Each structure stands twice: as structure tokens, then as C-alpha cells.
From Swiss-Prot:
Keywords of this entry: Carboxypeptidase, Disulfide bond, Hydrolase, Metal-binding, Metalloprotease, Protease, Secreted, Signal, Zinc, Zymogen
Cofactor requirements of the protein: Zn(2+)
Gene name, Swiss-Prot/TrEMBL: CPA1
Reported regulation of activity: Inhibited by interaction with the S.magnifica carboxypeptidase inhibitor SmCI.
Broad class of the protein's primary localization: secreted
Protein name stated in the entry: Carboxypeptidase A1
Domain Peptidase M14 span(s) in chain numbering: 11-304
Compartments in which it is found: Secreted
Reactions that this protein is recorded to catalyse: Release of a C-terminal amino acid, but little or no action with -Asp, -Glu, -Arg, -Lys or -Pro; leukotriene C4 + H2O = leukotriene F4 + glycine
Record lineage: Eukaryota, Metazoa, Chordata, Craniata, Vertebrata
Disulfide bond entries: 138-161
Record's cofactor remark: Binds 1 zinc ion per subunit.
Residues of the whole record sequence present: 111 to 415 of 419
Length: 305
């Protein structure tokens, strides 16, 4: 509300409240956090990224995006908690302090602004973007099937009306291109994490192909470690492995793209729960979900630094 200290982290918020939160956080920690606008959504909403840094010039960075699929509210809620957590733990937690003293963290809390607004306004279960085309009466593209990684291959739909529609061409969605351009221009990202829900899974590349990544042994052990850390708080059980062997073939995914860009530590988290509530996870589970997920994310960051 008036301070990030009075903000209710245990309830779901609207786009305006989350955007206001960002400005409060920056005003309160000007020497650590800054807000960058990397683009504008289809409906003209600004696309913001928070940069956490203690200095330096183009230091190795960690990318974290949440809410690419709008109905997965637990992700945007976790993103807000993460943002606050970073400012509270720097100088308090020895490990995190070491990370921030040497690396920058870029956090995109609402990757799909238009869809998020729609979930509050008209359809709580909407997941796609809100781009339109003359060729159809249907709206939107599945932003996590629009990346240039096996784009158009099996594991995505070419029908505009499909919930998994991949779009007319790779990076057609400005919400996706804005991230691609930013990351490529930066050129020094070491980790790329995309947060989703639900299923309680920690996945690594690839989803579009059966080919095994050359770094499978390392990413597999890192995932095993992150999962162990996450489970230590409330006993939440996660499974891990490559996308295609754990779920099914899925094309045009973001971590498949990031990994092909040379960003080794590319992982996707599917948060709580396992189906009891699914996308409609109770607000009472926000904080515990964020707390455990943080332990998992920090573990990955530690192996990156």
C-alpha cells in the first residue's frame, strides 16, 4: 500500500497494485533496485523488469520471468515476494549477499500484462496473450510456444483458436521479442529461469527434441539439489528432468531458446499444487509457496556464481 512493508503479500493483486509496488520498492532501495521498461504489450501496457545490482558494468546476470501464462497467479504473487525478499536478505544472508555482490538479477514479474489484466477483468483462466489477427475471430498466442526453438514443430498448435497456438512466426509476440532483444543485447546472462504453475516440477531442456543436452549431468544434479532444498521447508515434493521426458514434447519454449543462446543454467519451475486447486491456488498458500521456491532458486544461483 504505502510502503512495501504494508503491502499484503498473502493475497492476490491486480496489475496496477503490482506496478505501484515496483515504484515503492525502487524509491525505498534506490541503491539496489531500478525499474527498466523493455517494451510495450500488444495493448500498449509497459513491460517492466526490475534490476537488482550492487554496481559494476554488465556483470554476469540471472534472468527470472514469471506470469508468461496469465492464469498462473501464484507466479506473479511469488515474483512480488521475491522482489521484496532480495532487498531484505542482502547484507543478512551470507550466500545471497555474495551472489548480489558479484552478479545482477533481472526479474520480470508480469511477463504477459494484457493476459493478466484479462484474467481480472473477463476470464480468470485466460493464458495466452491478447494479440489479434484478421485470419481469425480467436485472440492470443501461447507465449511459451512462440520462441525460436523448434518453432512450429510438434508440441504446439497452428490453430489460432487453440490454447497452445504458437503464433504466425517465431517471436511474433512483442512480449516475447522484448525479452529476446534485451537478453541478446545484454550478452552476459548465465542463468535463465521461467516460473509457471502447476505440477511441482523442475525442468531443464529440451522440450522440442529428444536430443539430450551436453550439460545434462550437471543440470540434473543441480536440479536434484534445488529440489532437495525446496522440500526442506514444508515437505513439498517435486519431480525433475528434461521437459520432453518428464511431460511431453513441447515446441517453441523459452528455456530451450535460452539454452541454445549459450545460457547453460536454463530451468523452468512449475509451482504448487498437484491438482487439488490447480490454477486457483488459495491465497493462504502464497507465502509458503514463495518461501520454498526461493530455496530452490537460490540453490541454482549458487551453482551459477
Amino acid at each position: 500500500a504505502r510502503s512495501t512493508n504494508t503491502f499484503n503479500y498473502a493475497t492476490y493483486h491486480t496489475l496496477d497494485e503490482i506496478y505501484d509496488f515496483m515504484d515503492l520498492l525502487v524509491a525505498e532501495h534506490p541503491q539496489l533496485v531500478s525499474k527498466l521498461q523493455i517494451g510495450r504489450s500488444y495493448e500498449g501496457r509497459p513491460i517492466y523488469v526490475l534490476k537488482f545490482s550492487t554496481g559494476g558494468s554488465n556483470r554476469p546476470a540471472i534472468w527470472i520471468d514469471l506470469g508468461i501464462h496469465s492464469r498462473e497467479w501464484i507466479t506473479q504473487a511469488t515474483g512480488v515476494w521475491f522482489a521484496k525478499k532480495f532487498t531484505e536478505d542482502y547484507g543478512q544472508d551470507p550466500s545471497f549477499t555474495a551472489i548480489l555482490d558479484s552478479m545482477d538479477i533481472f526479474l520480470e514479474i508480469v511477463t504477459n500484462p494484457d493476459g493478466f489484466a484479462f484474467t481480472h477483468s473477463q476470464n480468470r483462466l485466460w493464458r495466452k496473450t491478447r494479440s489479434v489477427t484478421s485470419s481469425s475471430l480467436c485472440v492470443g498466442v501461447d507465449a511459451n510456444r512462440n520462441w525460436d526453438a523448434g518453432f512450429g514443430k510438434a508440441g504446439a498448435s497452428s490453430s489460432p483458436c487453440s490454447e497452445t497456438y504458437h503464433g504466425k512466426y517465431a517471436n511474433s509476440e512483442v512480449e516475447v521479442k522484448s525479452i529476446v532483444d534485451f537478453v541478446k543485447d545484454h550478452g552476459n546472462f548465465k542463468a535463465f529461469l521461467s516460473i509457471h504453475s502447476y505440477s511441482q516440477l523442475l525442468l531443464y531442456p529440451y522440450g522440442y527434441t529428444t536430443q539430450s543436452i551436453p550439460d545434462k549431468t550437471e543440470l540434473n544434479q543441480v536440479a536434484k539439489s534445488a529440489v532437495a532444498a525446496l522440500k526442506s521447508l514444508y515437505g513439498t515434493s517435486y519431480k525433475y528432468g528434461s521437459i520432453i521426458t518428464t511431460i511431453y514434447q513441447a515446441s517453441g519454449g523459452s528455456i530451450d531458446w535460452s539454452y541454445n543462446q549459450g545460457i547453460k543454467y536454463s530451468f523452468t519451475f512449475e509451482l504448487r499444487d498437484t491438482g487439488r486447486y490447480g490454477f486457483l491456488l488459495p491465497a493462504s498458500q502464497i507465502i509458503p509457496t514463495a518461501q520454498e521456491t526461493w530455496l530452490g532458486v537460490l540453490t541454482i544461483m549458487e551453482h551459477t556464481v
